[PDB]
Design a protein around this ligand. Structure first.
Ligand SMILES: COCCOc1cc(C)nc(N)n1
Ligand SMILES: [Mg+2]
Length: 208
């Protein structure tokens, strides 16, 4: 049912640094996630140029932002390439070890945390605002899986039998008790307009 894994040492250190460094400009977390979805949508666009059946699991390429105050979650959904179980386990398809290294030597030279994305590990910036992150993902070549972590050095992967999603990735942010501003419609608009106004994909902000 549920497998448990240790983060490689550098990733676990990255997540600690993200969770523990005083840094007030937390909103960039949404820029990085959106920008991740956009890269995944780019990849399935690319693959489908030569093989049109790739989009058999879904023609529409979009990004949805779904705030829920009940569950205190914000979900970024896309219909991108998604991840196989192997990639989920390998730091969600990133190069987090050397990315973390570059990022940490960039810090020691006057970078700041908002630059995390230039190093290919922007995903982890989810931990600027989430105490727990769940990733539901489905790639054409594999089953639908759920990855989950509350940091602390370990993460779980399980097969997800919940809502078949067809193809893409859902990032569910269980928000820190004091970062509920990111569930406000107005606040999400302001951030999407400021940081992601030019993203080549329709971004729908769901209402509650
Ligand atoms: C960006 O390409 C990676 C494959 O799928 C992924 C990976 C990550 C970290 N986020 C999303 N949204 N999709
Ligand atoms: Mg839609």
């Amino acid at each position: 049912e549920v497998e448990t894994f240790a983060f490689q040492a550098e990733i676990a250190q990255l997540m600690s640094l993200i969770i523990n460094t005083f840094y007030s400009n937390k909103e960039i977390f949404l820029r990085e996630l959106i920008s991740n979805s956009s890269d995944a949508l780019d990849k399935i666009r690319y693959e489908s140029l030569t093989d049109p059946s790739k989009l058999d699991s879904g023609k529409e390429l979009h990004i949805n932002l779904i705030p829920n105050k009940q569950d205190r979650t914000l979900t970024i959904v896309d219909t991108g390439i998604g991840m196989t179980k192997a990639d989920l386990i390998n730091n969600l398809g990133t190069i987090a070890k050397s990315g973390t290294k570059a990022f940490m030597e960039a810090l020691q030279a006057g970078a700041d945390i908002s630059m995390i994305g230039q190093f290919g590990v922007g995903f982890y910036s989810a931990y600027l605002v989430a105490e727990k992150v769940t990733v539901i993902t489905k790639h054409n070549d594999d089953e639908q899986y759920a990855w989950e972590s509350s940091a602390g050095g370990s993460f779980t992967v399980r097969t997800d039998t919940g809502e078949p999603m067809g193809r893409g990735t859902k990032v569910i942010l269980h928000l820190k008790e004091d970062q509920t501003e990111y569930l406000e419609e107005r606040r999400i608009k302001e951030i999407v307009k400021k940081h992601s106004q030019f993203i080549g994909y329709p971004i729908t902000l769901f209402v509650e």
